[PDB]
């Protein structure tokens, strides 16, 4: 028995993943190789994180990483969970460590999982809009995320998806008129602000 | 009028499609 200082074997592992990621045309091939390894349920979290960090080295978003994720999820759910977790990780804890660039890769990058339902949608709700606690980082992150997801769904299908979403921490109808100024105003800032209507009515209603 | 460097930067911007007609020198 040892008090363990370093994981070096696990940095070995970290390599082999990143490597398999950097061979491979396409994206649906990387999916294969990974799934060929038969990674244990322990690490099917960390593997995911590795991927995303590579995505952030990468100078810009790329369809590759997205189609990799998707074709990995539809193989099994344990990957599904692994992702949703990592969304919690990034957004809540780990945004603090990212520069205003890499949010450009993320915002979209989750945009493609969430438009096409691999996420699924409502796992967003965990995200909150308050001057109370939100990082101007996180502000930007979400900002992008919509300016991507919009550019697929086109603000109408999104009208549906929201209207069935019941996102609250994001959208209270029931209180914080102030935070409704902050919300709705902030979606005039993003610029979309055409799914903010009913809340605008509410602003008019409280008074 | 623009000067040799100045014509060049504007030209690159136009090349991107950035410049609307408004800003050309003439």
């Amino acid at each position: 028995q040892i008090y363990d200082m370093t994981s070096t074997n696990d940095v070995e592992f970290k390599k082999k993943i990143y490597l398999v990621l950097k061979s491979s045309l396409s994206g649906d091939e990387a999916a294969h190789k990974l799934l060929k390894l038969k990674i244990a349920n322990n690490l099917k979290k960390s593997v995911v994180d590795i991927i995303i960090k590579s995505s952030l080295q990468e100078s810009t978003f790329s369809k590759f990483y997205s189609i990799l994720s998707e074709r990995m999820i539809t193989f099994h759910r344990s990957w599904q969970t692994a992702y949703n977790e990592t969304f919690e990780q990034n957004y809540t804890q780990d945004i603090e460590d990212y520069e205003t660039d890499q949010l450009r890769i993320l915002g979209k990058f989750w945009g493609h999982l969430i438009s096409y339902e691999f996420l699924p949608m409502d796992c967003l709700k965990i995200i909150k809009l308050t001057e109370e606690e939100s990082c101007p980082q996180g502000r930007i992150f979400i900002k992008f995320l919509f300016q991507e997801l919009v550019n697929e769904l086109g603000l109408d299908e999104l009208q549906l998806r929201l209207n069935s979403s019941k996102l609250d921490g994001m959208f209270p109808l029931e209180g914080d008129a102030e935070h409704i100024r902050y919300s709705i105003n902030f979606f005039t800032a993003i610029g979309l602000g055409l799914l903010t209507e009913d809340m605008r009515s509410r602003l008019t209603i409280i008074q | 009028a623009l000067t040799s460097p100045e014509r060049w930067e504007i030209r690159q911007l136009i090349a991107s499609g950035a410049a609307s007609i408004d800003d050309y020198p003439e």
Binding site: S26, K63, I67, G154 | -
Partner: protein
């Protein structure tokens, strides 16, 4: 439904998203055409050599 053509080296196909009728995420051989004004992806373009 398709429209085709070729320029310089590229063999392009174009599908307007209407008559796709079944839409999917595609890997990177696919450009997405965006309405100038509205900002949507109304067609996928495919490429080959």
């Amino acid at each position: 439904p398709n429209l085709l053509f070729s320029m310089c080296g590229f063999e392009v196909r174009i599908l307007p998203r209407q008559r796709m009728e079944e839409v999917v995420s595609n890997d990177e051989g696919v450009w997405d055409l965006v309405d100038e004004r509205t900002k949507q992806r109304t067609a996928k373009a495919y490429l080959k050599v």
